[PDB]
Design a binder for this molecule. Structure first.
Ligand SMILES: Nc1ncnc2c1ncn2[C@@H]1O[C@H](COP(=O)(O)OP(=O)(O)O)[C@@H](O)[C@H]1O
Ligand SMILES: Nc1ncnc2c1ncn2[C@@H]1O[C@H](COP(=O)(O)OP(=O)(O)O)[C@@H](O)[C@H]1O
Ligand code: BEF
Ligand code: BEF
Ligand SMILES: [K+]
Ligand SMILES: [K+]
Ligand SMILES: [Mg+2]
Ligand SMILES: [Mg+2]
Lengths: 528, 528, 91, 91
């Protein structure tokens, strides 16, 4: 195979721990308020400027083979925490380093690192069992504003926008962020349905305004395959002209013949019609036109194994909408009279169809169908003056936004690290089975101080001194690292989701306590 | 050809022995409890963290040509043992090195290395003949749990899971392991047959659940070749609708026309049907559909020299299944009413069909058909929080699972090395034919202490001192390297399969005693 | 650019161990907001076509022909018309 | 030596562009004068010969034979007598 190189014992432990210490010293600076940004060279354009502890960890790759082993295994912690919880990746990396460093000391000749691993996990089980006791659910919409405000690096505008967006859509609604263009942030709540496609002929414009076709109380004709001929299109319009209401024609396309018919009857006496193609592109539009149909109340024509044909239509077979707005690039249906009792049954189908599968694209267009159909989604256009700025603030908005959705499902707990510091008394009643498990429990007992300690360190004060005076104090008292003094937390508004605390700890302890059981390291030769 | 380089005598012996020592020092640390893991650089992603002594050996490839020869020949020892027994690969590698080292010492000018080889094999034959005498069959379901607990590095949960899975499937049943997703381990005992293939059209879903088609007391239609036309499919459905039972259609494929009929009758009034292709891929499905046929009781249609055709079907000609479950990627038939007296004759045919042949793939799918059919199969989804952990825990689970399946066929024997230590008195009665054969017997006599000695060493105690105090002790007494004291074994629950002990010894002595007969080494030039 | 360097230089000096650069940033933007709020007060609209001639002459590095040409072109097309420049061939 | 480094380290941090290191020196010596003046208040004279044995025992890295030997040598010569040490030969 490949020529390899092996290193034994203390030498190898040292090199990997150097890789760990570097990648964690690089990410530890971005913690809490008074944390500091990290500029990463992008290989192509202007650089990134982050504070998130995964953009920092996933970038850093080392030359030396042994140091890189340390770095890779810390990337795996920071990555497992990001996907599972969405915030708390710095908290994970510093907890990881503390378990590696404290582990690469107790490895003498008689120590059993594997039993120490078992003790570490005994300690972690008891502590996440204590977090869950002292946790409390998030109830008031002011607690939502607080969690968002905290995880956004103390930017209160972010806290208000996300709380506002979550009050008008539901705590499990669909909020989504975009690269804004203006200077300030904007909350836009799309209400109703819309797809990114405009009218075919610019003769349907009856608005005398900004290039719009605008109707009220219109019919809808939903066709899966093209409307080629005059034959298939004529009966629908006879219905529309007879009842004297406008008509929208949503099909895969309107051929030049049926198109020539539509334009003609529009330009003379003035039948009210308008046409648009389907949302697209392939298999999806087949479901999405079906969604539109039951949203308005009607049938998709030409269907594969129903083949509702256009030649035999009937006025009830057409959908009905209160108002229709169509521009040169997008159409919006607003008030579909669609028998809500049945569209709710539809929503339940699409939500189980996503819980079942995942392909990153079927699940993508899947959520498109919920949002387009469900209670209006909120979108957040972030401001800023330059590009690198927006990408920073956008990393912070998403971490703020992930945090709130992890608090509403799994409760909140004290912040600043005080969440873990308030678990050490749980560890002080463990009775270890042997000497090695006792070593592990002491490893965790020390490590629980690291988060609070690293925030005070970044604040410019003495770390362990702040930690000691917190533990001596009451249960609600701890350190506000921005104001630089001790406060009640919830009254002051410092809280974190319990999910982010427990997953950060658990992914770190899992990975770190296995590194400390190593005795040999085998690396590929660095040929050139 | 290629320019080569030759080395003679003690110089080559030393360099090869240097290669052996390195690869064996790397693996020896992973022995017994208090052994320690080894981190291997993977060329692409996060590294491995193992304790299995073949993953450690097959990785280490050395730069030097001569040391690498030593490494390769130890790799082949470690690999021969793994494929034959599945555990005990560290046990072999330390035995191989010990025979190599003791052999490259007795090689003087007057010694005959090839007669030394003959003496070693006389000693090895005598000792595996002593293992089989002091062997004892495994009878109680608790000895299964102990063998598993021991070879899994003392993880008692693993022992209970493998013992439970082997009570509910049979001691020669089919247990198979998978990458679990949860945090804990799961024992799932599959009932019936299942193949990796789902429904064709996503209109057969009648569950309103995670995208499932779920039937009870259905008919089965087994077709070898495609169901193209409306013609061939109609008579079967007339049967299903008449008897008012659902129908499953397992064919090579369901063409778009018969498919269009199936989808149509499902969506209106609501005939209960569903279609899936055959398991595959080629000649195999011809046997596996026939297996499916007799398991349920019916006939495969379109057969080559029977050509049961679809147009003349009859209700006894259709199979019957109590419960049918089909998802988007897999179908499960559970309770086939198939005249068990005949499915048993099938089992006997397939088992005779494997004893005849071996192709590593014909025998693979052969075993797939057996397991799928009768007693159901168990799967062991392992927990864990990160990937590298799951991969580690999984190497240990398979080593335990191979150990239990190698113990139920060939009995158990003491552990901790005591199995071999209790065989030395056998060697003390050999009467060697000449001086060189005496040297070989003396080589193995020394080598038998290596396993017990290397366990105590990793535990942090004096190796040879423990080995001696064991031999002075009674026959059932030996060393528990976790508790650090002497115990009865079976009462304490330390046992090993006799199969893993003898194959490790035999593959080590086999290869090592041949390396020691070398006098020249020819290597390619290391150009660049 | 000189304003960017000056904020960079003055920023890479005050970074001691107790300083919070992110709050310094917040103050920088508070000051920029207040000062661009003062420019608009002391601003005054451009009304006469001679102020057009002056604005053009200054940003053209004090080339007065450029100012007259741009003022003339903007009188005959409208102040929001379409003026566009090309590689001439003459002198 | 440890006190010196701490003053050097803490001193090579407060040196920004506007700081005056020489005035920082003056404050350091103001603080040092104030603190050695507080030692002399909470000081107390050594009177009993057990406190001699204690001081000697401590500064000898806790070697209690050394403490008693020096107390005996200082009882028999005077507290400002002359004690002198040599390379011994015995155990
Ligand atoms: N203003 C603050 N005062 C004190 N502690 C804080 C403050 N803001 C955040 N923290 C704490 O700092 C930790 C960092 O949270 P996290 O989102 O992981 O920050 P980062 O994203 O920089 O790692 C959390 O445990 C949080 O409770
Ligand atoms: N708790 C224990 N006490 C003493 N010996 C043990 C214990 N567990 C395992 N062993 C011994 O260590 C040896 C290693 O077992 P095996 O799984 O083949 O080796 P490896 O550690 O390479 O997997 C076996 O002979 C076994 O009897
Ligand atoms: F860097 Be954070 F804690 F995700
Ligand atoms: F590594 Be073991 F002896 F299989
Ligand atoms: K961050
Ligand atoms: K092993
Ligand atoms: Mg973050
Ligand atoms: Mg093994």
């Amino acid at each position: 195979g490949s020529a390899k190189d092996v290193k034994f014992g203390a030498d190898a432990r040292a090199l990997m721990l150097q890789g760990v210490d570097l990648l964690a010293d690089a990410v530890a600076v971005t913690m809490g308020p008074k944390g500091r940004t990290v500029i990463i060279e992008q290989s192509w354009g202007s650089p990134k400027v982050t504070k998130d502890g995964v953009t920092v960890a996933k970038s850093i790759d080392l030359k030396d083979k042994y140091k890189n082993i340390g770095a890779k295994l810390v990337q795996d912690v920071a990555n497992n925490t990001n996907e599972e919880a969405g915030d708390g990746t710095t908290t994970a990396t510093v907890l990881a380093r503390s378990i590696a460093k404290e582990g690469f000391e107790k490895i003498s000749k008689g120590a059993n690192p594997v039993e120490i691993r078992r003790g570490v996990m005994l300690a972690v089980d008891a502590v996440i069992a204590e977090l869950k006791k002292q946790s409390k659910p998030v109830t008031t919409p002011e607690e939502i504003a607080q969690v968002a405000t905290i995880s956004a690096n103390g930017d209160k505008e972010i806290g208000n926008i996300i709380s506002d967006a979550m009050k008008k859509v539901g705590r499990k609604g669909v909020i989504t962020v975009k690269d804004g263009k203006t200077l300030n942030d904007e909350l836009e709540i799309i209400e109703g349905m819309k797809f990114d496609r405009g009218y075919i002929s610019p003769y349907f414009i009856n608005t005398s305004k900004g290039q719009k076709c605008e109707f009220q109380d219109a019919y809808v004709l939903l066709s899966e395959k093209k409307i080629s001929s005059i034959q298939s299109i004529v009966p629908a319009l006879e219905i529309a002209n007879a009842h004297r209401k406008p008509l929208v024609i949503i099909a895969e396309d309107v051929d030049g013949e049926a198109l020539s018919t539509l334009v003609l009857n529009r330009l003379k006496v003035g039948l009210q019609v308008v046409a648009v193609k389907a949302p697209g592109f392939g298999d999806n539009r087949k479901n999405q036109l079906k969604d539109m149909a039951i949203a308005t109340g009607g049938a998709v024509f030409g269907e594969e194994g129903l083949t509702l044909n256009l030649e035999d239509v009937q006025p009830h077979d057409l959908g009905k909408v209160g108002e229709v707005i169509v521009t040169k690039d997008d159409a919006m249906l607003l008030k579909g009279k669609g028998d809500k009792a049945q569209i709710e049954k539809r929503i339940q189908e699409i939500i189980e169809q996503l819980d079942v599968t995942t392909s990153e694209y079927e699940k993508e267009k899947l959520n498109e169908r919920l949002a387009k159909l469900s209670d209006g989604v909120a979108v957040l256009k972030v401001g800023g003056t330059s590009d690198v700025e927006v990408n920073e603030k956008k990393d912070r908005v998403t971490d703020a936004l992930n945090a709130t959705r992890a608090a509403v499902e799994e409760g909140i707990v004290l912040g600043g690290g005080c969440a873990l510091l308030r678990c050490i008394p749980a560890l002080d009643s463990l009775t270890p089975a042997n000497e090695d498990q006792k070593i592990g429990i002491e490893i965790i007992k020390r490590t629980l101080k690291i988060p609070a300690m690293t925030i005070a360190k970044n604040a410019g004060v003495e770390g362990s001194l702040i930690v000691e005076k917190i533990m001596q104090s009451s249960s609600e008292v701890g350190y506000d690292a921005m104001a630089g003094d001790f406060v009640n937390m919830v009254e002051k508004g410092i809280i974190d989701p319990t999910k982010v605390v427990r997953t950060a700890l658990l992914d770190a302890a899992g990975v770190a306590s296995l590194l400390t059981t190593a005795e040999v390291v085998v690396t590929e030769i660095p040929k050139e």
